[PDB]
Design an enzyme around this catalytic site. Structure first.
Site, PDB file in Angstrom:
ATOM      1  N   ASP A   1       0.783  -1.220   0.000  1.00  0.00           N
ATOM      2  CA  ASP A   1       0.000   0.000   0.000  1.00  0.00           C
ATOM      3  C   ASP A   1       0.829   1.291   0.000  1.00  0.00           C
ATOM      4  OD1 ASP A   1      -1.942   1.801   0.129  1.00  0.00           O
ATOM      5  OD2 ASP A   1      -2.777   1.153   2.077  1.00  0.00           O
ATOM      6  N   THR A   2       1.015   1.875  -1.181  1.00  0.00           N
ATOM      7  CA  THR A   2       1.861   3.065  -1.314  1.00  0.00           C
ATOM      8  C   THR A   2       1.213   4.304  -0.692  1.00  0.00           C
ATOM      9  OG1 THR A   2       0.982   3.516  -3.548  1.00  0.00           O
ATOM     10  CG2 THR A   2       2.961   2.191  -3.378  1.00  0.00           C
ATOM     11  N   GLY A   3      -0.090   4.215  -0.457  1.00  0.00           N
ATOM     12  CA  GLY A   3      -0.843   5.292   0.162  1.00  0.00           C
ATOM     13  C   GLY A   3      -0.762   5.258   1.685  1.00  0.00           C
TER      14      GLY A   3
END
Ligand SMILES: COc1ccc(S(=O)(=O)N(CC(C)C)C[C@@H](O)[C@H](Cc2ccccc2)NC(=O)O[C@H]2CO[C@H]3O[C@@H]4OCC[C@@H]4[C@H]32)cc1
Lengths: 99, 99
Positions: free
Chosen positions: A25-27
């Site tokens: 999850d880059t967020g």
């Protein structure tokens, strides 16, 4: 690995003999795992998302294997909808976004 | 480009004639933007995140340019703390996670 995003980027992780699923999850700045037992003394924290804030227990220096690769760092534990691997651990994997 | 994850992966986007900053978010199924007007009809939708669910407006087939690429798809508009670009649009850029 090269992970395309047609599907959720769910990978297998290993936490002290337990295998789990977790979203790459880059967020997410940080890694949040669903409620479970981890070693060490923890700081209660507040962590905020789409639907407001949830309370988490922060644990440090937690060994996790993601995708066969060993990482060690901070893990937050609390009422998340899914296990998420955040940037704090994706950098240890050497993940980048590419297009 | 190759985007590092040392920092939040923020990009400039153009939507509804407006320039915005948005977070490239592989843990997001859908693209969710802070309250704004769009020139299309919408339907309500409930979207669930770390704190639970929020009501959004769902605009279909919305053009967005991201880092100078023209993409089109579903945009959800509502009380999100940050603008996020989801997989529905990142797949159109050819975004992959790599490690
Ligand atoms: C500083 O440390 C943190 C702080 C915040 C978060 S987070 O989970 O709230 N989030 C931050 C973002 C809102 C600014 C990371 C996101 O990747 C979450 C991560 C996430 C995934 C699933 C469930 C809860 C959270 N995704 C999300 O809320 O997406 C929504 C929109 O599209 C759908 O895809 C997802 O899949 C279906 C539901 C969600 C929907 C994590 C670590």
């Amino acid at each position: 690995p090269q992970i395309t995003l047609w599907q959720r980027p769910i990978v297998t992780i290993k936490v002290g003999g337990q295998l789990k699923e977790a979203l790459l999850d880059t967020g997410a700045d940080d890694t949040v795992l669903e409620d479970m037992e981890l070693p060490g003394r923890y700081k209660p924290r507040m962590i905020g998302g789409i639907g407001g804030f949830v309370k988490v227990r922060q644990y440090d220096q937690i060994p996790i294997e993601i995708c066969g690769h060993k990482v060690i760092g901070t893990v937050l534990v609390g009422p998340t909808p899914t296990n998420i691997i955040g940037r704090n651990l994706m950098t240890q994997l050497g993940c980048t976004l590419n297009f």
